[PDB]
From TrEMBL, chain A:
It catalyses: (2S,3R)-3-hydroxybutane-1,2,3-tricarboxylate = pyruvate + succinate. Belongs to the isocitrate lyase/PEP mutase superfamily. Methylisocitrate lyase family. This is Methylisocitrate lyase. Keywords: Lyase, Magnesium, Metal-binding. Pathway: Organic acid metabolism; propanoate degradation. The keyword Transmembrane helix does not apply. The keyword Magnesium applies. Pyruvate 2 binds at R72. SUPFAM superfamilies: Phosphoenolpyruvate/pyruvate domain. One of its GO terms (biological process) is propionate catabolic process, 2-methylcitrate cycle. Pyruvate 1 binds at S48, Q114, R157.
Length: 290, 289
């Protein structure tokens, strides 16, 4: 095996960002999705809280632990040796929790983490809250990361556009950047002009969130690129299509008594053989044998 | 939220039931949830599907704890009887005992143990030898004494490597040892199904895995041929993988996922499936001063 180090992975990720061509970053909720993405030719992967929790059959409500997220992230790197950006929500607690989350991700050889200014958890009764923490509140958290894990590329998410306003978001963004963030995820900017303007007023590479059925139209990556973005995520797609596929094949087996008609909708044992690199284990066992 | 004994006694009733029991493989909780919503009454945790989901080959390099934690996820999501492929029990008799308790703790209904030999020798990785009959008998004995409430399926690979006769002999011994049902891998034809059925003192499980040594019989046909249950072990992962491939290629080469919108679970169905409402009702219900 020839795995990379975390510091190699973070720098490779940074390179990918600074690159002239836009970086597409697919969400992979598990190691199999991670392997397919790599084989499909993607150079970075995304672990979204949404897809992760949904995989475990849970709601995206911040009830998973940093330990759990760091282990699934392990699975991703262990499988692909690709830079992985991990959505760490708000750091799973305070400055100290954020500090430990940072170490655990470096241990998992995570290349980058995404932290947000959303205020969590939500007050009882108003669990559908939209309030954010103070700018300083995230600033300190970012400083905590830069302190304990300087080898970690930081993407900072802000939901300030839809709750406080455009210029408010720009102000928050530039603060997070000077605090140590290397890139900005501006949730739900509302137009072409807002994208270009935000890019113009903020001194950092920008991330675009291409999640389906959301507040963002289906622009191509090329479109995002000339509009001022240098990376784009497809966070939950892997789980959306998988869940659809369960439904269709389970329906079929229950209805018809057989999976006969869905054979074409399947990865073959041959494709599986090569995907999990079964061969490379064989050459290992025999090389040792002689 | 059923007890382990409840989940085990129901699975056993499902087996003895007149209608053949369909058991789909669910490699994770989401698969598990959909199987439940689809109407299935029991779930399977496949060794091949689990490991591959973690990007590993089925070579017995996952630990019992690993499998135990995934089984835990499945039972938690659905509260359905789950049958877990525990391989050879991940070690000796005392390892088998440990594996059993862990599964009982995880609220697992049934386990499946096989007579293949593990680990496999160098150079003989692709080897296909089984353990001595008593070795598996001792292991079944272990599970009976340590976890009496756990339903036992014993898989024999004897038809393929030894002969049809030894398969029957091994199976019957496993039965008398404590196996509640037997999994006869790769019986060759319907003739061999019935004969084995006539010669084996137990409920039988059919392996309906794809691209294998077994034709695509319907569940009802298996029932007519002697079987009381049938698994669909790797299917969830088989369809999950190909969907990744198609959508990722789409994104990679189109620059966008627009054309896969109809091939996706909606936010609304997601919301439904994970019971997001239940958490709202819990959260808001407590908000009463």
């Amino acid at each position: 095996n020839k795995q990379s180090t975390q510091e190699e992975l973070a720098n490779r990720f940074r390179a990918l960002v600074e690159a002239n061509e836009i970086l597409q970053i697919p969400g992979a909720h598990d190691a199999m999705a991670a392997l397919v993405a790599r084989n499909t030719g993607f150079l970075a992967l995304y672990l979204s809280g949404a897809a992760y929790t949904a995989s475990k059959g849970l709601p995206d409500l911040g009830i998973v632990t940093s330990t759990e997220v760091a282990e699934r992230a392990r699975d991703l790197v262990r499988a692909t040796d690709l830079p992985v950006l991990v959505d760490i929500d708000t750091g799973f607690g305070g400055v100290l929790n954020v500090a430990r989350t940072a170490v655990e991700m470096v241990e998992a050889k995570v290349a980058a983490v995404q932290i947000e200014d959303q205020q969590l958890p939500k007050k009882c009764g108003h669990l559908n809250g939209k309030k954010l923490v103070t700018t300083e509140e995230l600033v300190q958290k970012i400083k905590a990361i830069k302190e304990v894990a300087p080898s970690l590329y930081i993407v900072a998410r802000t939901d300030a556009r839809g709750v406080e306003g455009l210029d408010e978001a720009i102000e928050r963004a530039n603060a997070y950047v000077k605090a140590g963030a290397d890139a900005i995820f501006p949730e739900a900017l509302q137009s072409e002009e807002e994208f270009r303007l935000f890019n113009s007023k903020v001194n950092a590479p920008l991330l675009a969130n291409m999640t389906e059925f959301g507040k963002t139209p289906y622009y191509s990556a090329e479109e995002f690129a000339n509009m001022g973005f240098q990376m784009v995520i497809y966070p939950v797609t892997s789980l959306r299509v998988a869940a659809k596929a369960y439904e269709n094949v389970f329906t079929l087996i229950k209805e018809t008594g057989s999976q006969k008609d869905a054979l074409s909708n399947m990865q073959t044992r041959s494709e599986l053989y090569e995907t999990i690199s079964y061969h490379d284990f064989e050459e290992l066992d025999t090389g040792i044998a002689k």
